[PDB]
Design an enzyme around this catalytic site. Structure first.
Site, short mmCIF file in Angstrom:
data_model
loop_
_atom_site.label_atom_id
_atom_site.label_comp_id
_atom_site.label_asym_id
_atom_site.label_seq_id
_atom_site.Cartn_x
_atom_site.Cartn_y
_atom_site.Cartn_z
N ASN A 76 8.62 0.52 -10.35
CA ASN A 76 9.40 0.98 -9.21
C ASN A 76 8.56 1.60 -8.26
O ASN A 76 8.97 2.13 -7.20
CB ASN A 76 10.37 2.10 -9.84
CG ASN A 76 11.70 2.08 -9.40
OD1 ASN A 76 11.99 1.38 -8.08
ND2 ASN A 76 12.54 2.65 -10.06
N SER A 82 4.43 3.41 -3.00
CA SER A 82 5.65 3.30 -2.30
C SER A 82 6.79 3.65 -3.40
O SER A 82 7.29 2.89 -4.12
CB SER A 82 5.94 1.89 -1.84
OG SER A 82 5.27 1.71 -0.62
N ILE A 83 7.56 4.86 -3.36
CA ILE A 83 8.43 5.30 -4.19
C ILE A 83 10.00 5.06 -3.35
O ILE A 83 10.11 5.31 -2.48
CB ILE A 83 8.26 6.72 -4.24
CG1 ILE A 83 6.87 7.25 -4.40
CG2 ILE A 83 9.14 7.24 -5.76
CD1 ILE A 83 7.00 8.72 -4.86
N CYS A 84 10.77 4.36 -4.23
CA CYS A 84 12.00 4.12 -3.82
C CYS A 84 12.91 5.17 -4.05
O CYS A 84 13.16 5.64 -5.01
CB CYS A 84 12.51 2.74 -4.63
SG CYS A 84 12.73 3.33 -6.29
N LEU A 85 13.46 5.81 -2.99
CA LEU A 85 14.35 6.85 -3.00
C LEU A 85 15.43 6.67 -2.08
O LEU A 85 15.36 6.69 -0.72
CB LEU A 85 13.55 8.01 -2.51
CG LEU A 85 12.72 8.65 -3.86
CD1 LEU A 85 11.62 9.51 -3.04
CD2 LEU A 85 13.58 9.68 -4.48
#
Lengths: 146, 76
Positions: A76, A82-85
């Site tokens: 993820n 790169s954090i998916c939020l």
């Protein structure tokens, strides 16, 4: 921004998130940070994670940048951290309690959903090749976590 | 002086310690307070780990501060 940013600080100081500690560095009201500990369930127990934040000069009204200084092999997060939020997306309220954001990341690990993230390579490996994923998961632990 | 300590368990209580004391001593008091051993006891601050051989005045944490307590679960 000095006033707005201080808004969250009030609710943060009086009572900061127990699931994870966080606070601004020095009197500089612009750079925020936080930390997360292995929820004690996923393959990362005892692994401390650190993530920095970057508020825009145009007030939170602008999507803030976030990265992961720690090398986490979770399906993820890319290499650049790169954090998916979804929060950043339309779900971005010019006045949201970052406190909720941190939790979002906490529940992410305690409840992942391998689909089509920014890391399809790790998805497949984790999909069926669990044995290997465990190898890297534990290897990437001592690497930087510990 | 007085200082606040919060752990992942959500437990929060004000501890008592001297400004000249060392993180090595406070660790002995906090464990006796909650009962949690030092091995599982940890101290974090703005991403800064406190050393056992350090004085409060050294970290200039001042009074009425909030320390981030973390539990080091080994399980193996």
């Amino acid at each position: 921004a000095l006033k707005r940013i201080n808004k969250e600080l009030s609710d943060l100081a009086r009572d900061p998130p127990a699931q994870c500690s966080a606070g601004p560095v020095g009197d500089d009201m612009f750079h925020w940070q936080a930390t997360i500990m292995g929820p004690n369930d996923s393959p990362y127990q005892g692994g401390v994670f650190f993530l920095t934040i970057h508020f825009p000069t145009d007030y939170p009204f602008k999507p803030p940048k976030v990265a992961f200084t720690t090398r986490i092999y979770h399906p993820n997060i890319n290499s650049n951290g790169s954090i998916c939020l979804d929060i950043l997306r339309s779900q971005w309220s010019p006045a949201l309690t970052i406190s909720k954001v941190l939790l979002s990341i906490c529940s992410l690990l305690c409840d992942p959903n391998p689909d089509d993230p920014l890391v399809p390579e790790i998805a497949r490996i984790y999909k069926t090749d669990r044995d290997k994923y465990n190898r890297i998961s534990r290897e990437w632990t001592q690497k930087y976590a510990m | 002086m007085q200082i606040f300590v919060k752990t992942l368990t959500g437990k929060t209580i004000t501890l008592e310690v001297e400004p000249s004391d060392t993180i090595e001593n406070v660790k002995a008091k906090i464990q006796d307070k909650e009962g949690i051993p030092p091995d599982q006891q940890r101290l974090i601050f703005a991403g800064k780990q406190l050393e056992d051989g350090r004085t409060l005045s050294d970290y200039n944490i001042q009074k009425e501060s909030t320390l981030h307590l973390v539990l080091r679960l080994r399980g193996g």
